[PDB]
Nucleic acid binder design. Structure first.
Ligand SMILES: [Ca+2]
Ligand SMILES: [Ca+2]
Ligand SMILES: [Cl-]
Length: 669
DNA sequence: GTCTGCATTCCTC
DNA sequence: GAGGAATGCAGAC
């Protein structure tokens, strides 16, 4: 037998990897249960002809925010031991168990939409940081999902990322020698018959079969070279789709990208470099100090990198002396030693970012700008970072005494200090009338950070966490309603709500966290064989019962009522393809109920339950508690009314399964 | 309060 | 109009 571990942000992310495996593996025997209170497992017996295989996958829901926050040891430490110095967490880490220790097989991130603008690079720090470790990084994204006007659920025009973002994965793979890729899955809202923007999309770009093939070959310790080349080719076809749909005058053409991909030229030595310049756009309200004159100096010498208006460009070594002279004259830099450092004979990448909002809080999208530059040009390129947004007094003080202390506590400063050779600030200081100018020679510090790794040590996460919390409530709720209780229907979660009626599945995508009167439920369960009408049970999970907010029960029902007011995003016949939603659903065709789930170690009296029902308005309370000897989840269902009591009686009678080991549970009533 | 994930409006060319 | 610049809320701590 071989054992694998799936460490994920939550149970749903863990299960998404299992769905990928099960899509290609047709198992002869499947068993589910728990290895510990926190860790569910799936055991499979399958064959490749005459060759049988016995695999077990142990799931670890919820990552630590330090070394012993939830789990006894942090699986993420294996990434920082190989150079992942940014505070970045993928969605899933798959490991192999061998000689009492875990070995990382791959890191996987799931995205529900191909994001555009600066949202495309907001989390590029993950791909950069994990990518430099040698462990494969797979970024899976749905192509396409529409952005909505939340007041009427009407679709906004499709937006696509700059071709440089999908390209950055390919160039980071070439620079590091590791497998870093962007893979695309067909979204339910991919409807080329209705949207002209998708006229030239190549459907061979979709990678569902190839991702499952890759994962299974990795689990089998087989050669993945050819599967990796097919996936890299699809990532390149996406760059081609995007670059052929943008204007050539201020952006790289596909022939330019192709000449970099095939190794004819480097991104900084393209013969056509300079046909467009680097022209940073700065809002007039963001201007202060000498920022406008610095931007004029950059535009006097720069050559464009991928796009004229991306926040970075190049100053070729042939123009670096004159660029440095103009900067030094503008800011009165006279120190001979400093000027010599600035005038090193090499190409210079200039990145300009506001960095901070009017109160001094950091810009999230700016965190991925230097990682994007490093993925495109290499982390060893010389980078000059210019910042012009407002700094709080505490920030400028740390810059003047210990910049690494500031990098340690803030993710944006960590990005800047790890990847910049020179940091130039021309910033307003909150509470003061005029700007501060700083020129930081960060070369030595950058070099040391690029060699930093955490303590070398083997890891085998203990399946018993420090204590049981919200992640554990969700794992327990999900397992009972997905594998034990008979209802087939997909139900709902944060990524969308599916409702099955007749022989059709109706789905609402792009769910907002809240509506005018509703709150998005953590789980939605559909039960069809209890009443004449289908039952929709909306559940909110919390660590403790007092965490259940006032009117949360009423808010869960109102959220479902909000979705019923609109035509579902998509629909399909369960027997037959996804189409855009055509018919509206009817709320009276369903019974709606709400539930609050939490952990309680027998601290609630009859009066406490009466008060929780009054505060929340829930129809059902699900009190969960672990028993340690022997390990069991003890479940207490408290119905507020007769409809909820019928549901409880149904759950109790149907608490049987051929796949799931129900012996790990005890349903009090 | 600070940090980070999420995602929508604003503004330049 | 295209698309990058710029922005704040929320949850956990
Ligand atoms: Ca065989
Ligand atoms: Ca919850
Ligand atoms: Cl194409």
């Amino acid at each position: 037998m071989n054992v694998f571990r799936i460490h994920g942000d939550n149970i749903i992310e863990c299960e998404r990897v299992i769905d990928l495996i099960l899509s290609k593996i047709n198992p002869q025997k499947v068993k589910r249960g728990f290895i510990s209170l926190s860790c569910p497992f799936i055991e499979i017996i399958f064959k490749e002809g005459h060759d049988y295989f016995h695999w077990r996958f142990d799931m670890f829901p919820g990552f630590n925010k330090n070394t012993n926050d939830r789990w006894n040891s942090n699986i993420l430490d294996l990434l920082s031991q190989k150079g992942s110095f940014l505070y970045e967490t993928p969605d899933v880490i798959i490991t192999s168990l061998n000689n009492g220790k875990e070995e990382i097989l791959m890191a996987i991130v799931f995205c529900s939409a191909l994001q555009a603008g600066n949202q495309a690079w907001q989390r590029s720090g993950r791909a950069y940081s994990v990518g430099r470790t040698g462990y494969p990084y797979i970024y899976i994204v749905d192509f396409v999902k529409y952005e909505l006007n939340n007041s009427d659920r009407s679709r906004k025009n499709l937006r696509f990322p700059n071709p440089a973002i999908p390209y950055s994965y390919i160039s980071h793979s070439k620079n590091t020698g590791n497998f870093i890729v962007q893979a695309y899955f067909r979204g339910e809202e991919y409807q080329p018959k209705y949207d002209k923007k998708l006229k030239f999309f190549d459907e061979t770009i979709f990678a569902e079969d190839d991702i499952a093939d890759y994962i299974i070959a990795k689990l089998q310790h087989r050669d993945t070279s050819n599967i990796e080349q097919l996936l890299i080719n699809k990532n390149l076809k996406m760059v081609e789709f995007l670059s052929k749909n943008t204007k050539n005058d201020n952006n790289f053409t596909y022939s330019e990208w192709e000449s970099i991909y095939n190794g004819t030229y480097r991104i900084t030595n393209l013969p056509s470099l300079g046909r467009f310049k680097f022209r940073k756009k700065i809002a007039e309200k963001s201007l202060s100090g000498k920022v406008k004159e610095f931007n004029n100096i950059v535009q006097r010498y720069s050559v464009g990198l991928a796009s004229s208006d991306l926040p970075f460009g190049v100053i070729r070594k042939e123009s670096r002396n004159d660029f440095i002279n103009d900067v030094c004259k503008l800011y009165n830099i006279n120190d001979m030693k400093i000027i010599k450092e600035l005038k090193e004979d090499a190409d210079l990448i200039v990145c300009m970012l506001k960095g901070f909002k009017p109160r001094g809080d950091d810009n999230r999208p700016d965190r991925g700008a230097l990682p994007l530059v490093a993925m495109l040009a290499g982390e060893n390129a010389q980078i000059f970072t210019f910042i012009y947004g407002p700094l709080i007094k505490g920030a400028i003080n740390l810059i003047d005494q210990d910049i690494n202390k500031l990098a340690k506590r803030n993710g944006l400063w960590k990005s800047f200090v790890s990847l910049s050779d020179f940091i130039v600030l021309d910033c307003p200081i909150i509470g003061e009338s005029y700007n501060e100018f700083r020129l930081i020679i960060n070369k030595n510090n950058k070099e040391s950070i690029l060699r930093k790794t955490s303590k070398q040590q083997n890891i085998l996460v203990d399946p018993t966490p420090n204590h049981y919390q919200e992640n554990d409530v969700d794992t327990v709720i999900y397992s009972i309603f997905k594998y034990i209780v008979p209802n087939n229907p997909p139900g709902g979660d944060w990524s969308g709500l599916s409702i099955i009626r007749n022989g059709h599945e109706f789905r609402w995508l792009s769910l907002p966290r809240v509506s005018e009167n509703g709150k998005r439920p953590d789980h939605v369960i559909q039960i069809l064989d209890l009443f004449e009408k289908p039952l929709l049970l909306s559940i909110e999970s919390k660590e403790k019962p007092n965490d259940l907010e006032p009117k949360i029960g009423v808010q869960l029902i109102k959220y479902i009522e909000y979705l019923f007011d609109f035509t579902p995003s998509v629909q399909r016949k369960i027997a037959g393809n996804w189409e855009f939603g055509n018919k509206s659903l009817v709320p009276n065709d369903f019974i709606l109920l709400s539930a609050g789930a939490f952990i309680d170690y027998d601290n609630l009296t009859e009066n406490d339950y009466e008060k929780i029902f009054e505060v929340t308005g829930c129809d059902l309370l699900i009190a969960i508690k672990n028993q340690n000897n022997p390990q069991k989840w003890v479940i207490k269902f408290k119905p507020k009314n007769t409809i909820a009591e019928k549901l409880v009686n149904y759950i109790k009678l149907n608490f049987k399964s051929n796949i799931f080991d129900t012996g790990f549970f005890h349903i009090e009533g």
